[PDB]
């Protein structure tokens, strides 16, 4: 393991995101911990969501704060799983 800083900042990979989940929902519980540099919510076969999102925070303090505080989040019915998106080695 070991998080990796991305050009834009630190990124988290949110898993277990509701299928009807829209940018508004994810953008609702992830702005409270900092000014997210960017956000990403990946649709297919007319399915509104793909169940995951790449939330990016300018800092790392916020990224972690969120990673720990938003790990059990239960939005749109389902609970989520927040992890560091990019690690630095095998």
């Amino acid at each position: 393991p070991g998080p990796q800083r991305s050009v834009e900042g630190w990124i988290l990979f949110v898993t277990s995101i509701h299928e009807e989940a829209q940018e508004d929902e994810i953008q609702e519980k992830f702005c409270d911990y900092g000014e997210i540099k960017n956000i990403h919510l990946n649709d297919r076969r007319t399915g509104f969501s793909k169940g995951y999102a790449l939330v990016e925070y300018e800092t790392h303090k916020q990224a972690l704060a969120a990673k720990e505080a938003l790990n059990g989040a239960e939005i749109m019915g389902q609970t989520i799983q927040v992890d560091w998106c990019f690690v630095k080695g095998p």
Binding site: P3, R5, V7, W10, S16, H18, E19, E20, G51, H60, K61, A65, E68, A69, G77, Q78, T79, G89
Partner: protein, 896 residues
């Protein structure tokens, strides 16, 4: 105390003992289970219990007896200091985790209490280190932020302390137990650095101290092989330093960053130089020093890059100095695996810089480096001289291969800097490589390495030189190694060829020697990418190949790929010549098989080869061949009888059959298939594999009859004793259904055949799920899930569904809580979902009836929690993951 039996066989039995660690009696039996005079084996289990309980069941704790728990843990620690090691450490960590919970002074009194002499300090240190890591997992019913916040407030104490201890030890005698305690010390710090964050500005003190600690470990041995104790202590000192610079926040501290880096560099240089000596004493120290530099650059890209251009004098020097260390590191002598373990470190580093500059003048400023590096690589790209005659073990050789992969990747990357320039250097090194063998013909290492360097860049005048050089090189004169590379490097250049005539010359030649497989790969590559171009030589190669196969010298395994090249070469043949070539190249394969048809384990092999050979030739020839198959279909029947009992040969023949059958769609083959399959059926997994494959390409009579026979025969095998055979039947159960599932989606009008006995199908399909195979359960499930799908569209089939309605969901709920392994539970949310989309209403009822109104979906689960799970399951028809969550929770609550 039954845990003892488990220690002699932990793996194949756990479950019992584990949940016993969950029950509150776990608190009562732990301290008793780890008494005096008892076995260390269970005492460790007594300790792990208290530990898991302190982190997992703080919810089952009496706030009234909180301190008692501490005094309780403190006494044990006293008893076990000097007793069993593993245990003490466990008690220490138990004491720590305890403290974690009291955070919301504790960390300060802990230290005070402990600040045998030696042991005492070990205890404290272990205790304090285990603290920041427990807080990482320990469930404190407190927001993470405040659990982190509380701890972050006592960092300075921790370090300043350790930093104080060390210096204090810098004056006293370094006892064996002293190194060890100093290790815990330095490690303690490090752990707190990656777990909890502290400003780099306060790490300069310790940074420096650790540095001198390192030195005190390296310099006495120089006059350089040190004891493990000095080495462990050194590493830990180094790792902590790494942890210090890598911190996430440090990047914004250009000031402390330069300071620390400058001291790392100006203090570690010496040691590096001394180990760059050839009398290797420690490869361990240099890896961590080189690692630390390489890493400290990664964490501070801006300082490094800005120093290059903005050129703050303090930075241009620092940066160049940091790169010189890493460049040296990269250029370090010896093969990666045996002489110098630092090559990876340096390659990791260049990647970062190369990608960082591509994502200004830095590009031009990196060119020199990049160029120089390339050379170094090829230098390390040099295989081990047979001088050492590979006194290495395959491990090393296997790992070197991996190494080379990373080394050729690095090559690639630097190619992005100079699209052609790299090609120049490689040439230069090849020209020298010429003057290497020229003066000493034993210098094949430089020839193979240079060639290797070119092949490394084969994924993008300098190039043809390479080709000519390859032709000139008398491969029969130097080590076999050159022939394999030469040929392999040429294969990679398949594209650039589209110079082909000599390519063939080399490949065909390479077949003559030991390394046939290599030439094989090379040939196959050429055939696949530049067929049109080889048309003139198709008549030649094709025949040269048939000859090369004649000697039994060529490996059958490898000889198969040659069959690929042949088939591809045949395509480029003239009308007249094709069949005669096929006859000259296929007849032997069948007759050989035919001879065996005469009618063993030695024969089984020959049977497989000949079968695969065709299978392959067919595969590549599908790019007609019908006449070949027509007169062949009968022999597969014959082979099947010989192979009736051996799936190995069976699968081999079928594959062959399949690949040739592919040509027909794009019709006389269908007949012998039903004959060949009617012999096969007369119920191994490959058999049904083709039936499906055949069926799916015929989307009417030919198909319907074969599928109908397909279902009815499967049952016969499925009719074996349900209890054991069915378990034993896992392979076929998965396959059968996997095929009946694929046959459904495509070839859908098939569900239309009222003939098919579905009640029977589902009968068994519901069993499989309830099977003992870890994965075959998905097939049954997957099958049913796709039936319910089409079933909503055909009354005919809908019937079957209606009947199997509550039965299936019953079968599902049984496994999900009482029969299916804990992990294969999610695989069921598919059918439960397929039933809500087509039969929401019905499913809503079959669910309430089996869950809310049953005596026992399970005895333990609560009527309350049972009714709610039953509600959610029927409400979610848009999410499958949700089902997996609702499903799982209940699954747990169900089994208990």
């Amino acid at each position: 105390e039954a845990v003892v039996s488990f220690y002699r066989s932990n793996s194949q039995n756990h479950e019992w003992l584990t949940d016993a660690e969950a029950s509150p009696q776990a608190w009562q039996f732990s301290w008793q289970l780890m008494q005096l005079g008892k076995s260390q084996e269970v005492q460790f289990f007594g300790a792990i219990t208290l530990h898991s309980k302190l982190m997992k069941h703080w919810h089952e704790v009496p706030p009234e007896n909180r301190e008692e728990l501490k005094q309780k843990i403190l006494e044990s620690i006293v008893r076990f200091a000097g007793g069993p090691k593993i245990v003490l450490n466990r008690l220490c960590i138990s004491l720590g985790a305890y403290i974690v919970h009291m955070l919301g002074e504790e960390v300060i009194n802990t230290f005070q209490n402990q600040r045998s002499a030696d042991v005492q300090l070990w205890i404290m240190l272990e205790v304090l280190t285990a603290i920041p890591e427990e807080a990482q997992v320990i469930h404190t019913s407190v927001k993470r932020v405040v659990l982190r916040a509380e701890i972050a407030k006592r960092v300075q104490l921790v370090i300043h302390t350790v930093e104080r201890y060390l210096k204090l030890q810098m004056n006293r005698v370094w006892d064996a137990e002293a190194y060890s305690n100093m290790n815990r010390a330095v490690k303690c710090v490090g752990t707190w650095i990656k777990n909890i964050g502290y400003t780099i500005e306060g790490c300069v003190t310790i940074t420096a101290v650790l540095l001198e600690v390192v030195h005190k470990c390296y310099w006495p041995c120089i006059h350089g092989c040190m004891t493990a104790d000095e080495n462990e202590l050194a590493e830990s000192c180094l790792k902590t330093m790494v942890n210090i610079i890598i911190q996430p926040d440090c990047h914004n501290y250009p000031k402390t960053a330069f300071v620390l880096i400058k001291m790392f560099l100006d203090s570690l240089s010496e040691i590096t130089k001394t180990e760059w000596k050839r009398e290797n004493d420690n490869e361990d120290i240099i890896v961590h020093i080189y690692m630390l530099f390489v890493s400290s650059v990664e964490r501070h890209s801006t300082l490094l890059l800005s120093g290059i251009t903005s050129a703050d004098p303090e930075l241009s020097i620092l940066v160049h100095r940091i790169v010189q260390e890493i460049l040296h590191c990269t250029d370090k002598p010896g093969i990666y695996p045996v002489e110098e373990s630092c090559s990876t470190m340096a390659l990791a580093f260049w990647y970062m810089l190369q990608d960082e500059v591509f994502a200004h003048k830095c590009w031009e400023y990196i060119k020199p480096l990049y160029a120089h590096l390339t050379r170094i690589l090829v230098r390390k790209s040099e295989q081990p001289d047979e001088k050492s005659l590979a006194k290495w073990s395959s491990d090393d050789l296997e790992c070197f291969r991996c190494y080379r992969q990373d080394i050729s990747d690095t090559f690639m990357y630097c190619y992005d800097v100079l699209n052609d320039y790299i090609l120049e250097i490689l040439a230069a090194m090849l020209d020298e490589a010429i003057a290497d063998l020229q003066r000493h013909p034993t210098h094949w290492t430089k020839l193979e390495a240079c060639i290797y360097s070119f092949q490394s860049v084969a994924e993008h005048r300098q190039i043809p030189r390479l080709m000519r050089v390859l032709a000139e090189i008398p491969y029969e004169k130097l080590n076999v190694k050159l022939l394999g590379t030469a040929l392999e490097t040429m294969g990679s250049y398949c594209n650039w060829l589209m110079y082909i005539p000599p390519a063939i010359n080399l490949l065909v030649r390479g077949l003559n020697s030991s390394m046939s497989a290599q030439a094989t790969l090379g040939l196959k590559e050429l055939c696949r990418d530049c067929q049109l171009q080889l048309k003139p030589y198709a008549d030649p190669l094709l025949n040269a190949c048939h000859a090369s196969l004649n000697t039994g010298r060529m490996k059958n395994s490898d000889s198969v790929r040659l069959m690929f090249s042949i088939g591809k070469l045949m395509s480029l043949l003239r009308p007249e010549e094709i069949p005669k070539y096929l006859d000259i190249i296929v007849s032997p394969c069948f007759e050989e098989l035919q001879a065996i048809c005469q009618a063993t384990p030695a024969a089984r092999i020959r049977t497989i080869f000949r079968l695969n050979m065709i299978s392959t030739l067919f595969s590549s020839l599908n790019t007609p061949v019908l006449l070949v198959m027509q007169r062949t279909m009968p022999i597969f029947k014959r082979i099947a009888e010989m192979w009736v009992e051996e799936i190995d040969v069976l699968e081999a023949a079928c594959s062959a059959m399949k690949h040739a059958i592919t040509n027909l769609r794009s019709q006389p083959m269908l007949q012998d298939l039903c004959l060949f399959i009617v012999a096969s059926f007369q119920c191994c997994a490959p058999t049904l594999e083709i039936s499906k494959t055949a069926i799916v390409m015929f989307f009417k009579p030919l198909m319907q009859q074969l599928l109908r026979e397909f279902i009815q025969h499967s049952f016969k095998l499925f009719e074996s004793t349900p209890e054991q055979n069915f378990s034993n039947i896992s392979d076929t159960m998965e396959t059968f259904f996997g095929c009946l599932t694929q046959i459904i989606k495509k070839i859908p009008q098939v569900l239309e055949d009222k003939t098919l006995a579905y009640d029977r199908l589902v009968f068994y399909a519901q069993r499989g799920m309830t099977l003992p195979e870890s994965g075959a359960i998905r097939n049954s499930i997957q099958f049913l899930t796709h039936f319910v799908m089409q079933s909503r569209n055909h009354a005919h089939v809908t019937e079957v569904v209606l009947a199997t309605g509550e039965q299936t969901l019953y079968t599902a709920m049984m496994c999900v809580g009482y029969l299916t392994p804990r992990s294969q539970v999610d695989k069921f949310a598919d059918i439960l979902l397929a039933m809500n989309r087509k039969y929401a209403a019905e499913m809503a009822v079959w669910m309430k009836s089996l869950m809310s109104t049953p005596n026992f979906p399970t005895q333990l689960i609560t009527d309350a929690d049972k009714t709610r799970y039953t509600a959610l399951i029927i409400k979610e028809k848009v999410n499958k993951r949700l089902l997996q969550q609702h499903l799982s929770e209940m699954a747990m609550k169900t089994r208990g």
